Design an enzyme around this catalytic site. Structure first.
Site, short mmCIF file in Angstrom:
data_model
loop_
_atom_site.label_atom_id
_atom_site.label_comp_id
_atom_site.label_asym_id
_atom_site.label_seq_id
_atom_site.Cartn_x
_atom_site.Cartn_y
_atom_site.Cartn_z
N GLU A 178 38.30 32.33 10.00
CA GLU A 178 39.46 33.32 11.08
C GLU A 178 41.14 32.50 10.87
O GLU A 178 41.48 33.04 11.86
CB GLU A 178 38.79 32.88 12.28
CG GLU A 178 37.99 32.58 12.92
CD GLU A 178 37.42 32.10 14.26
OE1 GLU A 178 38.06 31.95 15.27
OE2 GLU A 178 35.77 32.04 14.85
N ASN A 184 25.75 24.29 24.44
CA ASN A 184 26.03 25.72 24.32
C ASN A 184 24.76 26.02 23.72
O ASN A 184 24.47 25.66 22.24
CB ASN A 184 27.32 26.10 23.35
CG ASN A 184 27.40 27.90 23.29
OD1 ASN A 184 26.87 28.50 23.70
ND2 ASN A 184 28.25 28.15 21.80
N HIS A 189 33.89 26.55 18.23
CA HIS A 189 34.42 25.87 17.77
C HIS A 189 36.04 26.13 17.38
O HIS A 189 36.53 25.95 16.62
CB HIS A 189 33.79 26.81 16.13
CG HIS A 189 34.18 27.90 15.95
ND1 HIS A 189 33.04 29.19 16.05
CD2 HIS A 189 35.01 28.91 15.48
CE1 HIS A 189 33.89 30.06 16.20
NE2 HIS A 189 34.96 30.51 15.48
N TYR A 223 40.56 21.03 24.26
CA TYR A 223 39.43 20.66 25.34
C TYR A 223 40.24 20.96 26.78
O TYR A 223 39.69 20.84 27.79
CB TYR A 223 39.31 19.25 25.40
CG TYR A 223 38.84 19.39 23.81
CD1 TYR A 223 37.27 18.83 23.76
CD2 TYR A 223 39.31 18.52 22.85
CE1 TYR A 223 36.67 19.02 22.68
CE2 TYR A 223 38.23 18.77 21.26
CZ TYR A 223 37.49 19.31 21.36
OH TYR A 223 36.52 18.77 19.93
#
Ligand code: ZN
EC number: 2.1.1.63
Length: 166
Positions: free
Chosen positions: A159, A124, A133, A101
């Site tokens: 991912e 978003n 994410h 962040y």
């Protein structure tokens, strides 16, 4: 700005894509086998999006070959820290990468705005496409997710991260 909708089935459940001739407005999760969009055809941003999501889930190795549709949701029409955050996230953090962040905050021009950044994430309108994410804790922990921790973890495991797909 006549809204057009189409739904797509995915490993995360039904996705509702909404948009106009000028751009994709929203991707909403209504809650192994690739599915087609319930309604074929334009506008173009919607076809691009559906093609983009199908690749993201079932053909990830080729995700970079798909054009990111033009966005037309209100949040993108005017300036705001929120837009700057979303855009920065969209253009910088790609498949397999994560960002804290604080790094996103600094990327948006204010290193001390980690909290505002976390806030911008809930605003978003196009999740996954804009990888909210991939914004995680500097502690190594996954962190909060507007759509539930389990979904965030699925996407991350999807991912390459060492988390089980919940
Ligand atoms: Zn529009």
């Amino acid at each position: 700005c006549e809204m057009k909708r189409t739904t797509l089935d995915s490993p995360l459940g039904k996705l509702e894509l909404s948009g106009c001739e000028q751009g994709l407005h929203e991707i909403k999760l209504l809650g192994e086998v690739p599915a087609p969009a319930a309604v074929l055809g334009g506008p173009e941003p919607l076809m691009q999006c559906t093609a983009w999501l199908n690749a993201y889930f079932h053909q990830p190795e080729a995700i970079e070959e798909f054009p990111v549709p033009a966005l037309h949701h209100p949040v993108f029409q005017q300036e705001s820290f929120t837009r700057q955050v979303l855009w920065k996230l969209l253009k910088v953090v790609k498949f397999g990468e994560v960002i804290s962040y604080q790094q996103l905050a600094a990327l948006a021009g204010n290193p001390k705005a980690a909290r505002a950044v976390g806030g911008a994430m809930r605003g978003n309108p196009v999740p996954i496409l804009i990888p909210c994410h991939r914004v995680v804790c500097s502690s190594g922990a996954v962190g909060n997710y507007s759509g539930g921790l389990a979904v965030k973890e699925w996407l991350l495991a999807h991912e390459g991260h060492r988390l089980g797909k919940p």
